[PDB]
Design a protein around this ligand. Structure first.
Ligand SMILES: CCCCCCCCCCCCCCCCCC(=O)OC[C@H](COP(=O)([O-])OCC(O)COP(=O)([O-])OC[C@@H](COC(=O)CCCCCCCCCCCCCCCCC)OC(=O)CCCCCCCCCCCCCCCCC)OC(=O)CCCCCCCCCCCCCCCCC
Ligand code: BCL
Ligand code: BCL
Ligand SMILES: CC[C@H]1c2cc3[nH]c4c(c3C)C(=O)[C@H](C(=O)OC)c4c3nc(cc4[nH]c(cc(n2)[C@@H]1C)c(C(C)=O)c4C)[C@@H](C)[C@@H]3CCC(=O)OC/C=C(\C)CCC[C@@H](C)CCC[C@H](C)CCCC(C)C
Ligand SMILES: CC[C@H]1c2cc3[nH]c4c(c3C)C(=O)[C@H](C(=O)OC)c4c3nc(cc4[nH]c(cc(n2)[C@@H]1C)c(C(C)=O)c4C)[C@@H](C)[C@@H]3CCC(=O)OC/C=C(\C)CCC[C@H](C)CCC[C@H](C)CCCC(C)C
Ligand SMILES: COC1=C(OC)C(=O)C(C/C=C(\C)CC/C=C(\C)CC/C=C(\C)CC/C=C(\C)CC/C=C(\C)CC/C=C(\C)CC/C=C(\C)CC/C=C(\C)CC/C=C(\C)CCC=C(C)C)=C(C)C1=O
Ligand SMILES: COC1=C(OC)C(=O)C(C/C=C(\C)CC/C=C(\C)CC/C=C(\C)CC/C=C(\C)CC/C=C(\C)CC/C=C(\C)CC/C=C(\C)CC/C=C(\C)CC/C=C(\C)CCC=C(C)C)=C(C)C1=O
Ligand SMILES: COC(C)(C)C(=O)C/C=C(\C)CC/C=C(\C)CC/C=C(\C)CCCC/C(C)=C/CC[C@H](C)CC/C=C(\C)CCC=C(C)C
Ligand SMILES: CCCCCCCCCCCC[N+](C)(C)[O-]
Ligand SMILES: CCCCCCCCCCCC[N+](C)(C)[O-]
Ligand SMILES: CCCCCCCCCCCC[N+](C)(C)[O-]
Ligand SMILES: CCCCCCCCCCCC[N+](C)(C)[O-]
Ligand SMILES: [Fe+3]
Lengths: 240, 281, 302
């Protein structure tokens, strides 16, 4: 009957749909590889989808996926076993090298632009009309590291103009240079800003930005990467 | 075996239990100590379930059903064929679930991300525990739990419901449903919004998030923003399930009568209780 | 602990954002509204502006007419007494015409006519608002996802109070406007068709509802888990994969064996939610037109 028809029909629809859904999520990081980077033998039942090209807004070109994948940075890792499936140990300083939970991707070295073609993110001193409308204004508060020692001070808030959101705290170190600190990895308190991931001694290692009034996708990744990695690698310095 | 960008992430560490012992992968999958735990609990449970199936004398999945002990057994142990098997199976499920959560924690650490996912999952686990542990205890027999079978479980739902009248009147049930509906609504729009920006009109340049925000400001006069909608989603979801637990944990424990009748409180407020006319006067 | 990013710990405000102006008729957009610091702790603090336009007004006017036409009926039931009105608010009900009138538009007002007026108003309210979702997108050059997603919802509503009442031969088969009454109608609709738990569309529909919660839980917690790498900025991540997208995909690959991309995850999303009322609509449509009792149907499959 009709009902039987409809339901049998639907289970068929649903199956080609999953198939679709699945092949679309195969647009990045495919095809699969062996730990040595050579193409892996068994890529699953699903074919790579036919490429699609994204036309990017501020004459920043196009992007076609799937496409040629490459890390575009040397990875400081060495195998710890003779068969597949085991960890790869950092061969240096994982933090300094950017592997592990400290990994960063070679994003473009251009900043994210707003709908108008202006830099999406800006230090608040250069954002004409912006102010802390609520909560504790961090600016001026010391930054304390997980080792419970002061590392610097808050000399500005880099805001996301389009979302009116605080993205990073710009911290001044003992030598007078500054670093960005992701907003998402610090606790603003009444008398201090506490950073659990980094011990005071690692703040200097936080990668620097080439221009003082801009951050690029590459530098966001290298920074967030680094600060995140502290959680696992600063661990010996963290007390509480 | 690895995604084109996976290797630099596959470093040692992050394990909660047992150091480097189980710190490794199997194909795409991460094992970890709890990798093993869940496997063991999952193996055992499925076994017991098959064992129930022979005692039942059917291999047909639409028929197979593992029932809790009958009320006469209260919160004591029961013979295998008479409810023990369900009790173990329930222990094993719990073991599986919790372990699966703790593995999520272990992966979280290795990758250096937040614990929001293990977190949210614990709500699912807590809803399940409400229906097979917290409610039966409080009620006083494993027998109030739902049976493990594809349709028999739908039956428990239907019977348990109709016991208190039309269950629609359970007030926390009303609230819990509003989230389920609301969440789906919000998943619908969020998915649609991002896609429409990323996949515009033919030959056009990729929209920007700013366009996304404008689109909603144009539509209903407010946009929660990109960070917002993700906070929103997590919340509606967790809330739906939170109220779902609540509506059950109260049902049969502190309220055992017809749910519709509980509304008489409102209608019988002394200031309008006796005023004639309307529906109730 | 650590900071979780469920609530902002510092609010930052600037000049009111009047937005992208693409092909939008700026004449129609309103003025910026105030800013809720309340809202600001969760998401955006800025209210407005909003776009009015012809369809917005028609929609918005029919919308109120519907609501009011029901409202006066409730008052008439309450004996115009504000006390009763409050006491009995969820008990009042605007019911469709009796089965006697069939698909007739001649039912007396106290006997079903008023229901038709209200519906007619709603029908109009809803479709215009649909066209509104479409146009608003067109004027910004965006995909029409939202309008199509919306159409799914519309499907179930169309079926409940219009398509099914018409295929059954009478308006009496439609849903009454009322809080407790539309609950009862639902509960009763299942009883009559032999328990909707045997309607496999109903069962499918529940799977996608449950799933929507499962997914929006998964997606939300994930994006929050990697916002420490600017995960929330999904469009740029799509355009240029960041570590955020990577950690996201990998956490999931390592847990359950496969994974999404940032554009990908949102396709999972729109389809999981859209299938709820899509399947739903179908389950209800066959209910009572082709299948009288899902249990009997369940025994044979035919
Ligand atoms: C009876 C039911 C009737 C009830 C009415 C309710 C209908 C509600 C449907 C809502 C659909 C939501 C979809 C969301 C979406 O993608 O929208 C954007 C999508 C693109 O938007 P755009 O702005 O035009 O383009 C922007 C970009 O250029 C392009 O942007 P893009 O890349 O994002 O869009 C590309 C998109 C294009 O999307 C579509 O083309 C949409 C397809 C609509 C399908 C409708 C489902 C009907 C359900 C049938 C169930 C059977 C039961 C009987 O790709 C897909 O999503 C492909 C879908 C894959 C379907 C798999 C089919 C398998 C067939 C079986 C094969 C055998 C299997 C082997 C075994 O919109 C549409 O294409 C419109 C579809 C409208 C049709 C409505 C039906 C009319 C009646
Ligand atoms: C929480 C609310 C009620 C209840 C009310 C209903 C109602 C009402 C319905 C279901 C439906 C279903 N229920 Mg139930 N269900 C409950 C508790 C459970 C439990 C549990 C351990 O707590 C589980 C595992 C299930 C599982 C299921 C599926 C068989 C089915 C589709 C659900 C879905 O899409 O979810 C979304 C999740 C996903 C898409 C992720 C993938 C889920 C897959 C499908 C899981 C299948 C597991 C199953 C085959 C058993 C495996 C166990 C062993 C390892 C073999 N229910 C409680 C008692 N359930 C619907 C149905 O059609 O089944 C008859 C239906 O109509
Ligand atoms: C006793 C009750 C019966 C039963 C009878 C029914 C009936 C009858 C129906 C459902 C339906 C549904 N049931 Mg059932 N159901 C039962 C038990 C359950 C259980 C359970 C036991 O755990 C669950 C989980 C469900 C779950 C569900 C949903 C999956 C499904 C509706 C999805 C939806 O989101 O629509 C919500 C979305 C809409 C209604 C879309 C409307 C969109 C419109 C356009 C909104 C306009 C707004 C308006 C103009 C006002 C404006 C707003 C103001 C400005 C604020 N049922 C039992 C067996 N169920 C529906 C279905 O699809 O079944 C197949 C349905 O018709
Ligand atoms: C795919 C399935 C899900 C879905 C999707 C969906 N719904 C949608 C969309 C989509 C994709 C839209 O684009 C569209 C939308 O614009 O949302 C922002 C819509 C929408 N879904 C809505 C509601 C809705 N969707 C629902 C369900 C669902 N929608 C599904 C679960 C439900 C239910 C019953 O679960 C409801 C109630 C609307 C918010 C919006 C469609 C708006 C519309 O058509 O308006 C027409 C008429 C008016 C302008 C009426 C206004 C009259 C009011 C002023 C009266 C009430 C006054 C009241 C006392 C006010 C106070 C409220 C307080 C909280 C402050
Ligand atoms: C809290 C909000 C919602 C939510 C969230 C949620 N679910 C989650 C997560 C999150 C955040 C995960 O991270 C985790 C996941 O990895 O998803 C891919 C998970 C998950 N949610 C799942 C299912 C699921 N979630 C559901 C619900 C929900 N999940 C909510 C609505 C439902 C239902 C019925 O609504 C189901 C069916 C899994 C796909 C996955 C967890 C997988 C897992 O725990 O693996 C460990 C266990 C096994 C491999 C099998 C164990 C076998 C048992 C020992 C025996 C079988 C016993 C069982 C009781 C029989 C039941 C029979 C039925 C017919 C009744
Ligand atoms: C980019 O922009 C944006 C998006 O992106 C695309 C979006 O998606 C959306 C779209 C999102 C939305 C419209 C979501 C908005 C959310 C809501 C309106 C909330 C949803 C939830 C509800 C309506 C439920 C309300 C319930 C409440 C307040 C209950 C509170 C708690 C209690 C009363 C206590 C409970 C205790 C009880 C009952 C005790 C019982 C005792 C006895 C029985 C005795 C928007 C707006 C957006 O802007
Ligand atoms: C933006 O970012 C995001 C991503 O990517 C960038 C993502 O991918 C995802 C994840 C989401 C998707 C890929 C979309 C599709 C997902 C769903 C519809 C959810 C439903 C899921 C399932 C049905 C799969 C359930 C599968 C499970 C639990 C695993 C299957 C497992 C097995 C067969 C074996 C289980 C493992 C065992 C026994 C232990 C380990 C193994 C040993 C041998 C030991 C999200 C949310 C996301 O937000
Ligand atoms: C404060 O008092 C005043 C008077 C000021 C008020 O305004 C108060 C007002 C309230 C008390 C209002 C309360 C309103 C509610 C309780 C409403 C509840 C509504 C629901 C629960 C609706 C549920 C389901 C509705 C459904 C499925 C409607 C479907 C409608 C349609 C598909 C439309 C079909 C079209 C029809 C039959 C006519 C078509 C005619 C043509 C010519 C095309
Ligand atoms: C996480 C534990 C879940 C267990 C589910 C039910 C187990 C019942 C345990 C009772 C065993 C014996 N008793 C009555 C003497 O306590
Ligand atoms: C978006 C893809 C995920 C879809 C989930 C498919 C599994 C649902 C199984 C429901 C069982 C249903 N049925 C028809 C017997 O009632
Ligand atoms: C519904 C769950 C689907 C998970 C898919 C997992 C893909 C695994 C690919 C094969 C890897 C094989 N193995 C375990 C033999 O090494
Ligand atoms: C109901 C949800 C079911 C999810 C559908 C299962 C998809 C499995 C995809 C496995 C992909 C294998 N691969 C390529 C990663 O090895
Ligand atoms: Fe998202």
């Amino acid at each position: 009957d009709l009902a039987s028809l409809a339901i049998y029909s639907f289970w068929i629809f649903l199956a080609g749909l999953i198939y679709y859904l699945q092949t679309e999520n195969m647009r990045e990081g495919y095809p699969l590889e062996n730990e040595d980077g050579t193409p892996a033998a068994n890529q699953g039942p699903f074919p790579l989808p036919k490429p699609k090209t994204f036309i990017l807004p501020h004459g920043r070109g196009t992007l076609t996926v799937p496409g040629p994948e490459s890390e575009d940075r040397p990875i400081a890792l060495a195998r710890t076993a003779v068969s597949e499936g085991f960890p790869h140990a950092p061969t240096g300083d994982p933090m300094k090298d950017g592997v592990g939970p400290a990994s960063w991707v070679a994003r473009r070295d251009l900043p994210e632009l707003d709908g108008h073609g202006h830099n999406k993110i800006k230090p608040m001193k250069a954002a004409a009309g912006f102010h802390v409308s609520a909560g504790k204004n961090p600016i001026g508060l010391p930054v304390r590291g997980c080792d419970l020692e002061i590392a610097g001070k808050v000399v500005d808030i880099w805001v996301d103009i389009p979302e009116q959101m605080a993205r990073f705290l710009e911290v001044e170190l003992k030598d007078g240079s500054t670093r960005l600190l992701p907003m998402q990895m610090v606790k603003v308190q009444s008398n201090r800003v506490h950073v659990n991931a980094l011990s005071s001694d690692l703040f200097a290692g936080i990668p620097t930005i080439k221009s003082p009034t801009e951050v690029t996708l590459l530098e966001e990744d290298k920074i967030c990467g680094y600060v995140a990695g502290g959680l696992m690698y600063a661990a010996p310095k963290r007390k509480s | 075996a690895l995604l084109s960008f996976e290797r630099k992430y596959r470093v040692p560490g992050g394990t909660l239990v047992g150091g480097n012992l189980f710190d490794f992968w199997v194909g795409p999958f991460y094992v970890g100590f709890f990798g093993v735990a869940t496997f063991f609990f999952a193996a055992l449970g499925i076994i017991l379930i098959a064992w129930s199936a022979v005692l039942q004398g059917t291999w047909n999945p639409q028929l197979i059903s593992v029932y809790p002990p009958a009320l006469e057994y209260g919160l004591g142990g029961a013979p295998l064929a008479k409810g023990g098997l369900w009790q173990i199976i329930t222990i094993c499920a719990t073991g599986a679930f919790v372990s699966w959560a703790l593995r999520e924690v272990e992966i979280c650490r290795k990758l250096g991300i937040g614990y929001h996912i293990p977190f949210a999952f614990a709500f699912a686990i807590l809803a399940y525990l409400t229906l097979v542990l917290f409610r039966p205890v409080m009620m006083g027999a494993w027998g109030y739990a739902f049976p493990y079978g594809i349709w028999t479980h739908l039956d428990w739902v239907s019977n348990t419901g109709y016991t208190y009248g039309n269950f629609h009147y359970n007030p926390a049930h009303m609230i819990a449903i509003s989230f389920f509906f609301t969440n789906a609504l919000a998943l619908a729009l969020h998915g649609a919004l991002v896609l429409s920006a990323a996949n515009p009109e033919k030959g056009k340049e990729m929209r920007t998030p700013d366009h996304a925000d404008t689109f909603f400001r144009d539509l209903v006069g407010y946009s929660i923003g990109t960070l917002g909608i993700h906070r929103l989603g997590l919340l509606l979801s967790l809330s739906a399930v939170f109220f779902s637990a609540l509506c059950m944990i109260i049902t049969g424990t502190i309220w055992f009568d017809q749910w519709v009748d509980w509304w008489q409180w409102w209608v019988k407020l002394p200031w309008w209780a006796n005023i004639p006319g309307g529906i109730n006067g | 602990a650590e900071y979780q990013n469920i609530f902002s710990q510092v609010q930052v405000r600037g000049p009111a954002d009047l937005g992208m102006t693409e092909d939008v008729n700026l004449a129609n957009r309103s003025g910026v509204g105030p800013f809720s610091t309340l809202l600001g702790w969760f998401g955006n603090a800025q209210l407005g502006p909003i776009y009015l336009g012809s369809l917005g007004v028609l929609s918005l006017f029919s919308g109120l007419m519907w609501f009011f036409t029901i409202g006066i009926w409730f008052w008439y039931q309450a004996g115009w007494n504000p006390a009763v009105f409050l006491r009995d608010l969820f008990f009042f009900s605007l019911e469709p015409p009796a089965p006697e009138y069939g698909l007739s538009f001649a039912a007396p007002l106290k006997e079903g006519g008023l229901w038709l007026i209200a519906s007619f108003f709603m029908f109009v309210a809803v479709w215009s608002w649909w066209g509104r979702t479409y146009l608003r997108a067109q004027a910004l050059g965006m995909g029409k996802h939202t309008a199509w997603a919306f159409l799914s919802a519309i499907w179930l509503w169309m079926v409940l109070g219009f398509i099914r009442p018409i295929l059954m031969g009478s308006w009496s088969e439609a849903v009454p406007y009322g809080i407790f009454s539309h609950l009862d109608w639902t509960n009763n609709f299942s009883l009559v068709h032999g328990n909707l738990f045997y309607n496999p569309f109903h069962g499918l529909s529940i799977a996608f509802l449950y799933g929507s919660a499962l997914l929006f839980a998964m997606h939300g917690a994930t994006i929050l888990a990697v916002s420490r790498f600017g995960g929330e900025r999904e469009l740029e991540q799509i355009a240029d994969r960041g570590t955020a997208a990577e950690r996201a995909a990998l956490f999931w690959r390592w847990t359950m064996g496969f994974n999404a991309t940032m554009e990908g995850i949102h396709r999972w999303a729109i389809w999981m939610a859209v299938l709820v009322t899509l399947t739903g609509g179908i389950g209800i449509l066959l209910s009572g037109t082709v299948v009288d009792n899902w249990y009997v149907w369940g025994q044979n499959h035919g």
